[PDB]
Design a protein around this ligand. Structure first.
Ligand SMILES: Nc1ncnc2c1ncn2[C@@H]1O[C@H](CO)[C@H]2OP(=O)(O)O[C@H]21
Ligand SMILES: [Cl-]
Length: 214
């Protein structure tokens, strides 16, 4: 009669998390100042905003307060569908507490979330859930495409939206030239307020697989 974690995932170390967090911040500051982005503001925000400049760091005001993480399976202590099934797996139990490296291939921004795209290894993909209830946007994409790290959310958006935004982006990119060059890579405008920075060099972040309890 033991209950599960709120969710399973890879939790970044202090050092790796700050490295990614900082890169995310720089991206928001650079994107917000980029002429291509400014030009499309009316596709990013939809209201009485002045033509003046939008600071994305402020826009994505809801940020993780501490270390960052890549969620694998949200369990809600066993109440989520597929939770018990996921937790019972040998590979989950065996991997519990193990160290991993996550490959970050891109940073992205939408009107709802700012995040980082994670490219899971085959070993890490074994820890990705295979549920009966799937996000419709995951269909047609490689397993684990949803893998991401939440860097920030718009005021009325929940962190879960980040992975869903990535799936939408990946559905979209499944490409035209980049519309800009930032120091860390090429900048793509995917439309509908969506932006992806494709990192010239993938970031590697160290993380531990474990379970979070609220
Ligand atoms: N229904 C869900 N499916 C997948 N991930 C979820 C779900 N609900 C919440 N999360 C994620 O679990 C964490 C606790 O809220 C948090 O980390 P995240 O991956 O940034 O989005 C959230
Ligand atoms: Cl919303």
């Amino acid at each position: 009669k033991d209950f599960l974690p709120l969710y399973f995932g890879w939790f970044l170390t202090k050092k790796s998390s700050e490295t990614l967090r900082k890169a995310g911040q720089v991206f928001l500051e650079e994107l917000g100042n980029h002429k291509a982005f400014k030009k499309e503001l009316r596709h990013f925000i939809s209201g009485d905003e002045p033509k003046e400049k939008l600071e994305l760091v402020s826009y994505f005001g809801k940020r993780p307060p501490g270390v960052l993480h890549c969620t694998t399976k949200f369990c809600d202590y066993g109440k989520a569908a597929g939770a018990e099934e996921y937790a019972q797996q040998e590979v989950v139990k065996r991997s519990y507490g193990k160290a991993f490296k996550l490959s970050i291939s891109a940073l992205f921004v939408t009107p709802k979330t700012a995040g980082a795209q994670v490219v899971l290894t085959d070993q890490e993909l074994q820890l990705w859930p295979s549920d009966l209830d799937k996000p419709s946007a995951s269909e047609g994409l490689p397993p684990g495409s949803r893998a991401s790290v939440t860097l920030g959310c718009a005021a009325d958006v929940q962190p879960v939206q980040t992975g869903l935004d990535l799936l939408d982006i990946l559905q979209q990119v499944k490409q035209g030239e980049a519309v800009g060059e930032l120091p860390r890579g090429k900048l793509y405008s995917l439309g509908k307020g969506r932006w992806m920075l494709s990192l010239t060099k993938k970031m590697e972040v160290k993380a531990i697989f474990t379970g979070y309890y609220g």
